[PDB]
Each structure stands twice: as structure tokens, then as C-alpha cells.
RNA sequence: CGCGAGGGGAGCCCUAGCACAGGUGCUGCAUGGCCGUCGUCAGCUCGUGCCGUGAGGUGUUGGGUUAAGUCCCGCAACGAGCGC
């Protein structure tokens, strides 16, 4: 089930504007674009979900983020459809790093959300 | 007190003396207060996060607008205070 899906049309991307580090994940350069090695992809997908799963079952929250248009919307979906926080707009600076202070606004949200109906 | 004369006496006053007052005498570079000026000009900063060996940055650089740090949209920043 997996392979086919991917092999479908979900691999190989940016071309000639890469990073040599990422050279471990790549099959070849067809007509220009870098054809990522899915074979290896799979292997990694595993360990990844393993982690996700080994966490999704222990009451742990995850934070998804995607501030790019060619991927905004969807991320908005998959998040609400999982109750997992997320970021679709401008990922403010110091969120995680200055949470306590960013939160201050979240509180200001309800501060109004309440004064809304009154 | 006292028949009374007169005698003691608390304020206030006059003399004497003691302790002290008073000085627009100096220092506005010892000061408080208050006033004048840049100028009512659009400005000056703070809390936390982040960058930087550090002084310090970022915020408050950029795009449009305004009498305006006025408002907006952007953004490793997220907000706030004194000014407007």
C-alpha cells in the first residue's frame, strides 16, 4: 500500500539548489531534478512514526507547522482533525522560546472572546 | 487669709542678666522648588525571547499613510509604559 502511493507522485523535488548533507537521501538526478531514494525514505518513515506512535499512545501533544502556501490549508486540517496544536500563519518569533510571553496574547484573545458577547 | 490696713500671687508689661535672635553677607557648579530651551518637535525607553566574546543589536530596519513611534501590512520577535 505504501510504496505505490509515494511512487505515485510524491518524491523527487528541488533541483541543483540542494545541500550536500542530504546526499544520503537521494537516488539520482533525472533531467535535472533530484530523485530522492524512496527505498530509504520508507525506512525513515518507520522510525519516525514509531516515535509518533510511541508518543501518541502516552498522552503527548504535538505541534505542527507549515507557513508555506503550497501546504498551508491542509496543515490547518490535519491539526483540528486531531486536536494537535499547529501554525498556519506567521510563526511568531520566540513562541516555544518565549511561550510564557506569547501566551500573554492567547489570554488576551479570550480577554476579548468574552467581551465579545456581553 | 483678711473688719481693715496689708500680705502671698497666676497672666501681661518695664528694668537687669543669662540662653539666643537677626544678616537681600558668599556659594544657583553643594541644593529643593519653580521657570526658560531644543519643541508639541516625534521622539525616549522598558519586560521576556533570540543574535553577538562583548560594547550592543532585534523590538523601534522594510512597504503604504499620516500633523504624529497615526494607523496598516510585513518581520525572531511577542507585548508594554511615558509621549501623540
CA→C1' distance for A3 and B30 (Å):
88
Statement: the CB of A70 is under 7 Å from strand B: no
Give the residue among A88, A44, A81, A46 at the shortest CA–CA distance from A64.
A88
For A29, the grid coordinates are 538526478
For A34, counting Cβ atoms within 10 Å of its Cβ (0-12 exposed, 13-18 middle, 19+ buried), the class is buried
Q: Which positions of chain B lie under 7 Å from any protein Cβ?
A: 47-50, 74-79
Resolution in Å, one decimal, please: 6.4
Decide: A88 and A67 in contact? Cβ < 8 Å. Answer: yes
CA→C1' distance for A86 and B8 (Å):
105
Statement: the CB of A94 is under 7 Å from strand B: yes
Cα(A50)–Cα(A46) distance, integer angstroms: 6
Would you state the torsion angle of the CA atoms of residues A50, A55, A58, A64, taken in this order, to the nearest 10 degrees? Answer: -140
For the four alpha carbons of A80, A84, A88 and A90, in that order, the dihedral sign comes to positive
Residue A48's φ and ψ, nearest 5 degrees, are -60, -65
Residue A64's φ and ψ, nearest 5 degrees, are -95, 150
Amino acid at each position: 500500500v505504501k510504496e505505490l502511493l509515494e511512487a505515485g507522485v510524491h518524491f523527487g523535488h528541488e533541483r541543483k539548489r540542494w545541500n550536500p548533507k542530504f546526499a544520503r537521501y537521494i537516488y539520482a538526478e533525472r533531467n535535472g531534478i533530484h530523485i530522492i531514494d524512496l527505498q530509504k525514505t520508507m525506512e525513515e518513515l518507520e522510525r519516525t512514526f514509531r516515535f509518533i506512535e510511541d508518543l501518541a499512545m502516552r498522552g503527548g501533544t504535538i505541534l505542527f507547522v507549515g507557513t508555506k502556501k503550497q501546504a498551508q490549508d491542509i496543515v490547518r486540517m490535519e491539526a483540528e482533525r486531531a486536536g494537535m496544536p499547529y501554525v498556519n500563519q506567521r510563526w511568531l518569533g520566540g513562541m516555544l522560546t518565549n511561550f510564557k510571553t506569547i501566551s500573554q496574547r492567547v489570554h488576551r484573545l479570550e480577554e476579548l472572546e468574552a467581551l465579545f458577547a456581553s
